[PDB]
Design a protein around this ligand. Structure first.
Ligand SMILES: O=C(Nc1cccnc1)c1ccc(Cl)cc1Cl
Ligand SMILES: [Zn+2]
Ligand SMILES: [Zn+2]
Length: 174
């Protein structure tokens, strides 16, 4: 197994997957680490049991899906893919807003809040989770305006959207 956490790329107290070489800090894995198979492996198993699950889907259909166990897992995995990027640090904890010329967002949002919401089964459809995630980056874009720091929101949103399209097998388009 790997000697660093798959998510944050640091050593430490690591838990090793039994069905692949990946390792995780306890609370870097999502869900928190409970033989044992990691979320990458569990996601692969879903695909292997239903090959047609990889055919293209419409985003509008995906968003309306109820959060049954497989969709819950896929959202957990998508959230984890965002934390895998080091730039997720800017969006992980609760933000505060005091900048000349700007007003904070009406509904603040951050990755650890989405993590807690998933853990507490607060989302009944995929749409709820995706709306909160997109809100993180939209809030950031609106607040920082013309500061070059706005680009961090564009960058991390791109990671979210690419992984959303992959994990939920969104139909490819030009
Ligand atoms: O962050 C977390 N836990 C943690 C524990 C100890 C050191 N660092 C981080 C955590 C765990 C579970 C959930 Cl649902 C949300 C969070 Cl936000
Ligand atoms: Zn880690
Ligand atoms: Zn694994």
């Amino acid at each position: 197994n790997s000697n660093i956490c798959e998510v944050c790329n640091k050593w430490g107290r690591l838990f090793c997957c039994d069905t692949c070489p990946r390792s995780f800090h306890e609370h870097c894995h999502i869900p928190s680490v409970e033989p044992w198979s990691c979320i990458f492996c569990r996601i692969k198993t879903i695909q292997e049991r239903c090959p047609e699950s990889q055919s293209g889907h419409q985003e509008s259909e995906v968003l309306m899906r109820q959060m049954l166990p497989e969709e819950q897992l896929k959202c957990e995995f998508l959230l984890l893919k965002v934390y895998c990027d080091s730039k997720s640090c800017f969006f992980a904890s609760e933000p505060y807003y005091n900048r000349e010329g700007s007003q904070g967002p009406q509904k603040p949002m951050w990755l650890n809040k989405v993590k807690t919401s998933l853990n507490e089964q607060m989302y009944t459809r995929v749409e709820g989770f995706v709306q909160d995630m997109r809100l993180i980056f939209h809030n950031h874009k609106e607040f920082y305006r013309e500061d070059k720091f706005t680009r961090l929101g564009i960058q991390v949103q791109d990671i979210f959207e690419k992984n959303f399209r992959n994990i939920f097998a969104i139909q490819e388009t030009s």
